[PDB]
Amino acid sequence: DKSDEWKKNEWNNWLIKTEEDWKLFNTAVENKKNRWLEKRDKELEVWLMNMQNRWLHYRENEENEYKAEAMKNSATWDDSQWEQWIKTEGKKGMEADLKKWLNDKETFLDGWISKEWVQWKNERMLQWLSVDWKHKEDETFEHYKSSKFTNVLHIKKKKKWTKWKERTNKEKEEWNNWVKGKENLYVNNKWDKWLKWKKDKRALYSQKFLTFINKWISDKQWTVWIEDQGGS
């Protein structure tokens, strides 16, 4: 039925609407990312409260290499050696736990956002490829050499095949260029807000660790660890 020029214009209008629809998708993604980051504020605050409470005790059902490394000296260490340990190895363990918490959240974020983009791109592509006249011409020309060549000699190509191949080639190139202009937002993406959030939380929580360590020392909290482990 329809001419090659009509089919070109149908693609042009479809790409315009796709760019418009992308703006709504991107706004929804940004809103979801911002709300996710807000919820990490709450989760990090809860995480710190739980970690601090865990450092108050060393019950016999706990397996912890850091606490064992200190407690194998618990018969011989004076106060100054407990203080030196918590300020060096104690803080190093708290910093390592926070580092892996942040890496875990970064891993989830990248997988979640990248998969939403993969899904959206494909939903878009399926919408175009399943258009009735588009699916029809693609089935006609992709699978049969009968529709490509004028006769069994397989020399001269049919005019309509050439029109289809040239049109679909250029539209695939346009689509690929459009996708590559947006892909960096979701794939291997550097989210500056998350990077600044990580650096700010590391600095704040490092000082929170030091404040907690000072209280642990002032309360001689290792005496509770010893009693938890059976000591008198």
Author numbering: 460 to 691
Question: Could you pull the original sentences from the published paper?
Answer:
To establish how the C-terminal Tryptophan/Threonine-rich domain of PVP01_0000100 mediates reticulocyte binding we used X-ray crystallography to experimentally determine the structure of this domain. The structure was refined to 1.45 Å resolution and had one molecule in the asymmetric unit. Consistent with the NetSurfP predictions, the structure is composed primarily of α-helices that are arranged into an extended three-helical bundle with small helical domains at each end. The conserved tryptophan residues that define the domain are distributed along the length of the helical bundle and are all buried within the fold, contributing to the arrangement of the long helices. Since experimental determination of this structure, new methods for prediction of 3D protein structures have been accelerated through use of deep-learning strategies as exemplified by AlphaFold2 (AF2). AF2 predictions of the PVP01_0000100 Tryptophan/Threonine-rich domain structure closely resemble the structure we experimentally determined, with an RMSD of 1.56 Å over 213 Cα atoms. Analysis of the surface charge of the PVP01_0000100 revealed extended positively charged patches, mainly on the N- terminal and concave side of the protein surface, similar to the shape and surface charge of BAR domains, suggesting a potential lipid binding function. PVP01_0000100 CTD showed specific and strong binding to sulfatide, an anionic glycosphingolipid found on the outer leaflet of multiple cell types, including red blood cells. PVP01_0000100 binding to sulfatide followed a sigmoidal binding curve, suggesting a saturable and hence specific interaction.
